[PDB]
Amino acid sequence: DGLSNLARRLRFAMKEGSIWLGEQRMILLHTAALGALRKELVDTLGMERARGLFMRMGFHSGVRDAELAKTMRSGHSDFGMLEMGPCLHTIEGVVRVTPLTVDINIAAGVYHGEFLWEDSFEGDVHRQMFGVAQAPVCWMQIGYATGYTSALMGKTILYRELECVGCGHPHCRILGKPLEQWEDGEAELALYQPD
Amino acid sequence: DGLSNLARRLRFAMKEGSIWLGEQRMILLHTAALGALRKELVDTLGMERARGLFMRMGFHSGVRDAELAKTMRSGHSDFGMLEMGPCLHTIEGVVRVTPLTVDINIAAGVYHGEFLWEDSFEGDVHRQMFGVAQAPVCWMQIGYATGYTSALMGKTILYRELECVGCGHPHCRILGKPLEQWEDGEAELALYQPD
Ligand SMILES: [Zn+2]
Ligand SMILES: [Zn+2]
Fold first, then answer.
1. Which of A18, A118, B58, B152 is exposed most, by the fewest CB atoms within 10 A?
2. A71 in contact with B at a CB cutoff of 8 Å?
3. Any idea where the domains of chain A sit in the sequence?
4. N- to C-terminal Cα distance for chain B?
């Protein structure tokens, strides 16, 4: 699960003013600052584009952390490498993740995962800027799960929220599965690109 | 000195999936993910509008940090309270700050500050994507300095970069002083408000 094996990779070089998570440079960013950005994007670009922007930012984060996890192979169970994703997301202060059910085989291209999200920073941030939302709103967090799992699997795995604190639900709950297996699948993939 | 005691204001609450700096919730975010966002914002809104968005994001960060620093006023002169700013910015992994000249008296409305910035994450990220620019580019970093100092002084203190790594300089260098003393001060102020 890499409950800490990952933790070695997290270094604060404060005498150099830098933070590293693996080979990736990190900053500590106030959720309030991200909130202000979110409100301006929604106001300028409307809700739909803001969502795509945040999803793509999360996707880039997720892909980077998958690259980290894959360097530390050490013959880790398809299951153990997957769980490094939830750990890194938690270590990054984004959300507290509890795997509910996870069916995975990387060589076969098989993945179905369902997860519990507690204390989602994004849903809470969205509520602060917007009040409770009418649809799930953890765009960047969903982007991350998609990016990490897709890079891990070497194939497109898309996630969606089934419930969300941003909607006034008590937690978030997510489901990921291959692109092929979403009815409205590349309706979703459209919000995972640039331009 | 203060870098060490201020780092003690940072808490990792992993079992609740969160990171705290003073009272503010923080996330660890990949600079590569922020860069992808910046690239998309520049592509979709243009450099000028992107600049405002990031300056305002930074402003909100700085203003929040000001409250956290003030809380620890226990034995701290106008200089000590102002130094928490550069220190927190460094702990956040944003930039490594070396104060060059700090002239501050909050009661008197006196503020003149010059700082050296090394390893600005923002300038480094910016040039990787767009190559070197003509105007300085550390928008969010300048917004932070502006928000932090302004909230501390209770009057508007703007910062501008005299040098920037995004311009081909080896370092960034900033100057902060009251609003009335800047060439296009009122224009700048407009960048810190809605569009
Ligand atoms: Zn959510
Ligand atoms: Zn700069």
1. A118
2. no
3. 1-195
4. 41
